[PDB]
């Protein structure tokens, strides 16, 4: 049960380290980013500084499937 629910949480979701000055209304950004069709409008010059680091969530899908 733990492996099935954790694998259902791993896919279908994303994790990211934000800086505290990356974008205005970061909760709004992670609401529209959770969709599979995301049109997220950010502040200007927010794609060249890399203040958001999307971490790889599914580094453990295969091992949990085998277990």
């Amino acid at each position: 049960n733990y492996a099935e629910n954790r694998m259902g949480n791993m896919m279908g979701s994303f994790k990211a380290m934000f800086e505290e000055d990356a974008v205005v209304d970061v909760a709004e950004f992670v609401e529209t980013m959770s969709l599979d069709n995301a049109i997220a409008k950010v502040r200007p010059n927010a794609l060249k500084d890399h203040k958001i680091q999307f971490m790889n969530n599914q580094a453990d899908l295969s091992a949990l499937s085998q277990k």
């Binding site: 279908g12 979701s13 505290e20 000055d21 990356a22 205005v24 209304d25 970061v26 992670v30 959770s34």
Partner: protein, 195 residues
């Protein structure tokens, strides 16, 4: 709230023009440049949201807003208005007509308009006060200062402008930090996609 006096004083000091007698830059020029800076700041950060709920009939067909920057939601009798246009389409889907700070409905229908938009409240006097968070001070200076540095007073004015651009970028980062801390959710995890 920011007083115009302190913005003006900082700009005068930074331009090596903090002389009461001389004033090589007229205060009308500074107030116009501050209006321009307020324009750019309020547009980029969507600082001021305003709601107007009026009624349009066959007598008066347009809704005169003020210092319009953008419309983010329109309701007509609690019905969503979808598209925006400036052409006065005769018939078809129901669209919002924008006429350079005049708002109406394109295939006109009697009713009421509830519109959410953005505003300036620009200034006209040196003794006025800018109703903005104090954190917005440095972004007002460094943005109006880049507008004045490109007067050809010195042969090295553009490098100084380039330095002030980076300073302005840092000020905008601070402002974004403030805005996120104010008007954004305090969340630490995302939600799973539900389809």
């Amino acid at each position: 709230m920011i007083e115009v006096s302190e913005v003006i004083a900082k700009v005068r000091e930074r331009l090596n023009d903090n002389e009461v007698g001389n004033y090589e830059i007229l205060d009308s020029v500074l107030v116009e440049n501050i209006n321009q800076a307020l324009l750019k700041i309020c547009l980029e950060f969507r600082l001021k949201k305003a709601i107007t709920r009026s009624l349009i009939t066959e007598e008066e067909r347009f809704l005169t807003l003020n210092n319009l920057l953008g419309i983010e939601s329109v309701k007509l009798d609690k019905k969503e208005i979808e598209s925006r246009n400036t052409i006065e389409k005769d018939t078809g889907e129901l669209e919002l007509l924008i006429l350079s700070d005049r708002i109406s409905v394109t295939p006109f229908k009697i009713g009421e308009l509830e519109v959410v938009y953005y505003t300036y409240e620009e200034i006209r006097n040196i003794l006025e006060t800018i109703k903005l968070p104090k954190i917005c001070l440095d972004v007002l200076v460094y943005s109006v200062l880049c507008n004045l540095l490109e007067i050809p007073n010195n042969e090295t004015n553009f490098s100084v402008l380039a330095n002030y651009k980076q300073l302005l970028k840092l000020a905008k980062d601070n402002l974004t930090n403030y805005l996120s801390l104010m008007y954004s959710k305090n969340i630490h995890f995302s939600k799973v996609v539900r389809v």
